[PDB]
Structures are given as structure tokens and as C-alpha cells.
């Protein structure tokens, strides 16, 4: 990859390979790293997005309505599925999530990492 | 075994500037997820450097936590692992040290913007 990577951007990213219940393959991800890191760091922190389910069932899941964000399907952000990617894995930028949606992402992220102290 | 937030585990991280190799990691996932989920979220620990030069890094003294070298926790190098990768538990970080980790996590993930 990108030229201005910003927090909340939804990128097509290469996650291959993984093992176990980890989410891999070329799939959409959301940038959750702060924008200073997104500019200077060689890597970005992302949360995985899946289309296998489209409804959020646990507090660390956030839904994306395709009638709003231009995806194949209604999708779910998996804030329990976080990984740091070299910026070369970011293929295409699909869109970005609104401030109101990133509010939900931030909440699920705080629950996911136990930042309730 | 139980997996608790703050535990320092030896985990097989290969394959992966992403950190790779059978390396020490610290559990940063909440304890409810550490019990019920098949996966845990961890932050990388490196022995290449010994000082935290940015606030997203947290140092840990080898004279305090039964460690190889004076290491640095990299709270911008975080990944979700299947629990089968966790090999041996070495120790755990105190509530004082995890508070620094929490703060570094707040910076790293940009949860500090208002």
C-alpha cells in the first residue's frame, strides 16, 4: 503493498500458511495498528475477517454488512484472530471501516486482549 | 495445565520482518478466551536487543524471570496461535510488568486516541 496504510483500512492480504484453528489464506483483514506504526514500521497488525459466518456470536466478533462496505458476503471481524504481517502481504485495499464501526472493533479488541485494568 | 494471561511460554512459531522460530512468547489474550478458545494471542519476545527504544516495547530482566538474556517484549509483534504450539511454560510476568504490557498494547493498537 500500500502507500497510505491507515487504521481501519480493509486490505486483501496473504496469510498463507497457518496451522490449526488459525485463519489463513488470501482473505480480507482490517488494520488495527496505530497510524504511526502503519507509516514507519515494516509490519502491520491486522485482525482477520471471515465470510464463513456472518453473525457475531461472541463479544470479540464484529459484523460487516456487505450492503454498506462492498464485500462478497456479510462478514465477521475476528478480534481473537490477530497477526502481524509484513507490509508486502497487503495486496489490494478494499475499503475502510467508519469511525462508528471501529468503535465496535476497539471494544472487542479491548475484551480480546484483556485490556480491562 | 492452565493458560493464564501473562504466562511466558516456549512456542513453535515457524514458519513466518515477522518474528519466527521456536521462541518465547507472552500470553496477552483475556483469560476467558484462554480457557474456552482453541487459540491464544501472544506477543513476541526477542533477545537480540536489550532496551525498549519505543513505548510499544517492554524490557524484562533475566535476573528476575528465569530467562536466557535480557529480553524485550515486542507489543507490535503479536499473533494468534493454536494452543498446540505452546510447548513449555517458563514463568509468568508480574501484575506490575503486565501493566506496562497493557500500556504498550494500548499504544501499539492505537487505543489511545481521544
Amino acid at each position, epitope marked *: 503493498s500500500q502507500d497510505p496504510i491507515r487504521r481501519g483500512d480493509v486490505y486483501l492480504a496473504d496469510l498463507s500458511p497457518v496451522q490449526g484453528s488459525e485463519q489463513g489464506g488470501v482473505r480480507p483483514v482490517v488494520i488495527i495498528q496505530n497510524d504511526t506504526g502503519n507509516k*514507519y*514500521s515494516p509490519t502491520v497488525i491486522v485482525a482477520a475477517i471471515t465470510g464463513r459466518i456472518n453473525k457475531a456470536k461472541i463479544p470479540t466478533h464484529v459484523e460487516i454488512e456487505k450492503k454498506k462496505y462492498k464485500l462478497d458476503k456479510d462478514s465477521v471481524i475476528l478480534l481473537e484472530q490477530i497477526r502481524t504481517l509484513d507490509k508486502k502481504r497487503l495486496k489490494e485495499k478494499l475499503t475502510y471501516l467508519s469511525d462508528d464501526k471501529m468503535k465496535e472493533v476497539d471494544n472487542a479488541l479491548m475484551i480480546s486482549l484483556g485490556l480491562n485494568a | 495445565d492452565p493458560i493464564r494471561r501473562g504466562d511466558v511460554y516456549l512456542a513453535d512459531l515457524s514458519p513466518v520482518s515477522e518474528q519466527g522460530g521456536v521462541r518465547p512468547v507472552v500470553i496477552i489474550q483475556n483469560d476467558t478466551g484462554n480457557k474456552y478458545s482453541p487459540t491464544v494471542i501472544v506477543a513476541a519476545i526477542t533477545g*537480540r536487543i536489550n532496551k525498549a527504544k519505543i513505548p510499544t516495547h517492554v524490557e524484562i530482566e533475566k535476573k528476575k524471570y528465569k530467562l536466557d538474556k535480557d529480553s524485550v517484549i515486542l507489543l507490535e509483534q503479536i499473533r494468534t496461535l493454536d494452543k498446540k504450539r505452546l510447548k513449555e511454560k517458563l514463568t509468568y510476568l508480574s501484575d506490575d510488568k503486565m501493566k506496562e504490557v497493557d500500556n504498550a498494547l494500548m499504544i501499539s493498537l492505537g487505543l489511545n486516541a481521544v
Partner: nanobody, 129 residues
Framework: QLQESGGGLVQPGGSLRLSCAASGFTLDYYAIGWFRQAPGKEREGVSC????????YYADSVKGRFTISRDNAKNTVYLEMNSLKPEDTAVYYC????????????????????????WGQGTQVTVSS
């Protein structure tokens, strides 16, 4: 340790060359950064290179105008500044980070908060008309 010079007063469109010399250690094994501090604004990483002469970062505000280069024979690093603009007015600092290095990435060491091992004393650059 880290001695720097080359600043001064220039008119818009002029050029300068900053120098950064080290005494007691070899700069070729270090990550080198050039930072500028303008009044009231955050420290800005303008040009940085890792210990390998093949991973250079330039700030977008200086891309095409500034050039960093290491002289391993003089143990010195330079910042060549061309087409200077009034918005380049600031105190310029060079900084060196000793190895081992965590990342071979110039941009990583140009982030505003990175605490380099060694810093220059700073030199004023002023561009006005």
C-alpha cells in the same frame, strides 16, 4: 561522540549540506537518522537508513530534495538538502543506533519516538526571504 555541523541561513531555493561525524565508534555498523525539530511541532524523522546502505527512508515532505549518504572512510554521514523551503526551517539532529538492530528498516528508526543511543548537538537551518 556525535558531532554535527553545516547549518546556516539560506534563501528559498538554496542548498546546504549537513555533516555528522562520530569519534570512538564506527558509523557503518549503525542505523543513522536525521531529525528536525520545528517550533511547536513534533519531532519529524526526515531521512533514515539502517546499518545496511540499502534501506533508506525519506519523509514525503523531503522526497526528491534531500539525500542521505554515508562516508565510511571519514566515519561521517551527510544530509544534502536541495531546493530548501521556508517550511524546512528547524533544528536538525543526526542520531546513531548501535547494533544489534531489531529491524533492517530505515523507516522504523525514523519514527518520532525512537530513542537512539547517540544524538548530535543539533544545528539550526533557516530558510527565509
Amino acid at each position: 561522540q556525535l558531532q554535527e555541523s553545516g547549518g546556516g541561513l539560506v534563501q528559498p531555493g538554496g542548498s546546504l549540506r549537513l555533516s555528522c561525524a562520530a569519534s570512538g565508534f564506527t558509523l557503518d555498523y549503525y542505523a543513522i537518522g536525521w531529525f528536525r525539530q520545528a517550533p511547536g511541532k513534533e519531532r519529524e524523522g526526515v531521512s533514515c537508513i539502517s546499518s545496511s546502505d540499502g534501506s533508506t527512508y525519506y519523509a514525503d515532505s523531503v522526497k526528491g530534495r534531500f539525500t542521505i549518504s554515508r562516508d565510511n572512510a571519514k566515519n561521517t554521514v551527510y544530509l544534502e538538502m536541495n531546493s530548501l523551503k521556508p517550511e524546512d526551517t528547524a533544528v536538525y539532529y543526526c542520531a546513531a543506533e548501535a547494533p544489534p538492530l531489531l529491524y533492517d528498516s530505515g523507516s522504523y528508526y525514523c519514527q518520532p519516538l525512537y530513542q537512539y543511543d547517540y544524538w548530535g548537538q543539533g544545528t539550526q537551518v533557516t530558510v527565509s526571504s
